Symmetry: C3
Subunit: 339 residues, 3 copies
């Protein structure tokens, strides 16, 4: 909630407390796991009027896990999700630097709209598909003011030489283009980047460059939300083989995600969805699925501050998946206070 | 401090900075330890009017330790203490889920009122006696509106299969009942829960179920505060033997806690107390004390934002306690800014 | 931003999001390193009117690193920087206890004014030169009201027996005196403290007492800022030898730091600086430099909420420094949103 506007600056300290429990059969061979998954968020989002053609802004957001004891495990799952600052200059564009959303998420955002799950391909610290560190992002709305509805972005991703290959990346460049009109939206995004010597020393994966792309289509108007994403990747999508205790990236994946939702006046928002990501040319296994489910779920909004929800993952992953991916369904039930 | 009310929601971001030092003789064989114990708290507490019969609410609260260097020990003692959200429906009751106070703390709260120490039996992540993860809590004030002063609660505790037996728990159920009138209060609470295979593989403890109960009596009115708790436990109270480098739970404990306090108009709040928890049927030791002291202490309130305090623990634990429990007294001196 | 004043208390929750990147040649043999260094800060600062001669106050401030993945490295560089509470009584002085600035920083503060780097001798958890835990600090402005411009302080540092010698300290006492008038300022500060048995078991260092002192001169007025610090140390300044994989403290250091800055009306603030700390009588090496550079940098302030900056470290450290200290220059470029 905007707790502060004076002079020319408004600051919004914000958060949520999310009482959350997953129900699976027993969580080891499941999709989401089983048990308490309670967490909270806290952040600030700020914007200052420097002059009439120029604003400056910043954002930070942290995740606190609520499902750890107060002993030595207390920090498990705690992390900063965003931290960046930027300037936006009238007709010219915005420029921000920090930990932000990777630019292909401009497409994956179309379907990442389920109450609890969804967005399975938007991995954190995975080049351009999710949140990631060290990106410079330029964004332009309405093509310099000359074409209403036509937007684009470019993003420079700095090398992050980390101790895990899963969380590292080389230097890279990505971009996105979107056009909206009378409720319809279409988007494409693509990015490529160098892979580190660590990522390459691993078994799964082969190549010195990583590539991700996705297109998105969506209808959003008259209480209806429909959206579809299609995407591929090379040497980008992290994957593990749990039988040989093995890990790396899938040389190839192709991905589809569909979502349909309606929002009633009284506050019920039903959702259905479908998602499948299939890895290909995986060293030692061949073609294999990483994600494959239908979803049914719903969110009840009491108001802008309070919601409850249920999310049910009908998992079509099969019982002999050669990487060991989980076969059982998961339900999540949620109660959220936010401000 | 309420930093935000608008529409129908009020949010209180809150905290304290607590300059705190313990004085013992040398801290190894003491009650509280010796040295700097500075810390801060930060949280939000929120409540939204959904309609005239229904409110939604949430709370989060974190502890930052102020007595760690800025190097690799910097996270020591940092943790989320609370994180939950709920709804409260008029005459019907409240329901919240998340990390919250266990329901037998509804009784132990009577005596957990000392400036620095006290509440020795309200262990964190120990079934129903302190803060704990994965509880669903229902609470009813004034018996549906039909009996002023008569309150009750029930709590469902979900299994937390953690890597330490100290911080794990099985599934369980607990409850409390209280009646207050013209300044007097009486309360009882009880809970039981399954113990994990980890808790059971340990030496101290025997049984596949954990049980805790306590009653409370208190007088609170005319600047006087008097309160008394009595409690027992089986396979619930965590305990260590420091000679054999051994740990587990005490098959039995019985506990007493008494407190007397007066609050002067000018801001001095003197306190005296007594506490003893005795473990029984402990494998290899027999009956032994875990806690045994008198306390004298006082808090000076300058106003609702500033206090200072001293707390002195006259430790009756004896010099040959067979678990090694500390024999020396501890003094704490404190300076607190809070908002 | 002051988000809260009512009754007699005002609370300022505050922070910044700092998009930050370092450019060195390749970061291993450099001054600052290379890559993303994004971070955020968050804190509260509060002050309550207890009466007309007495205020109470508190402060907490945390650092969140923005350059870590969301996996297991997520906590790297996260820490509390300050946490203390105190009272200030009219003409008599202030007294605070907690994690605060060590008192010789009252002198080193004169030159710690560069956009990104600078203040190389104000080490964290290093007795009196930087931030440190367990200090009681008394401060007096204007000599009890009797001498405008003449200020002083005394600080008691409690032993911190930590697991690293780098972050530990013995008991100690330090102080500072300053006089300002018509834009000029002069300051001296000194402190000494016992060293732990851990600090002494290390190779580099010899002695059971640690000592730090510095004087400061500064001119600050008419948009001009000039300042100079001189300082020495014994058994205080932490140092590593990277060839023998060795660490400890330098028995002796002498240090100089100079800064010149001008602030234009339109918001450009150019800076130049020079810094050299030379360690002496180092076991096995003799006399050697720890820090030696010129700096050129500038900060552009759009307003009180937004800035950008560049900081360039022309490193005079030489290519065969016997401890291995880095020889290459570093540039930092920064974009800061703050409130
Ligand atoms: Br937690
Ligand atoms: Br992820
Ligand atoms: Br990051
Ligand atoms: Br700390
Ligand atoms: Br505890
Ligand atoms: Br928890
Ligand atoms: Br980060
Ligand atoms: Br440091
Ligand atoms: Br500290």
């Amino acid at each position: 909630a905007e707790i502060y506007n004076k002079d020319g600056n408004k600051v919004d300290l914000y958060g949520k407390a999310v009482g959350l429990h997953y129900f699976s059969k027993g969580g080891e061979n499941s999709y989401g796991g089983n048990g308490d998954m309670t967490y909270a968020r806290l952040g600030f989002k700020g914007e200052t009027q420097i002059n009439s053609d120029l604003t400056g802004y910043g954002q930070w957001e942290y995740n606190f896990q609520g499902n750890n004891s107060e002993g030595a495990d207390a920090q498990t799952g705690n992390k900063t999700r965003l931290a960046f600052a930027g300037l936006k200059y009238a007709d010219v564009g915005s420029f921000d630097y920090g930990r932000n959303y990777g630019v292909v998420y401009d497409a994956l955002g179309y379907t990442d709209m389920l109450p609890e799950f969804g967005g399975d391909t938007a991995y954190s610290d995975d080049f351009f598909v999710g949140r990631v560190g060290g990106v410079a992002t330029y964004r332009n709305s309405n093509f310099f003011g000359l074409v209403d509805g036509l937007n684009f972005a470019v993003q420079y991703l700095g090398k992050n030489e980390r101790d895990t290959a899963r969380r590292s990346n080389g230097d890279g460049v990505g971009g996105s283009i979107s056009y909206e009109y009378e409720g319809f939206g279409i988007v494409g995004a693509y990015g490529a980047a160098d892979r580190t010597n660590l990522q390459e020393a691993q078994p799964l994966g082969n190549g010195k460059k990583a590539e991700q792309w996705a297109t998105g289509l969506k209808y959003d108007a008259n209480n209806i939300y429909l959206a579809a994403n299609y995407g591929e990747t090379r040497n980008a999508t992290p994957i593990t083989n749990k039988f040989t205790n093995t890990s790396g990236f899938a040389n190839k994946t192709q991905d589809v995600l569909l979502v349909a939702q309606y929002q009633f006046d009284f506050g019920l928002r039903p959702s259905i969805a479908y998602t499948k990501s299939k890895a290909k040319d995986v060293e030692g296994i061949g073609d294999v699925d990483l994600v494959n489910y239908f979803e049914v779920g719903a969110t009840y909004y009491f108001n802008k501050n309070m919601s409850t929800y249920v999310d049910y993952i009908i998992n079509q992953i099969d019982s002999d998946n050669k990487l060991g991916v989980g076969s059982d369904d998961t339900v999540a039930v949620g109660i959220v206070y936010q401000f």
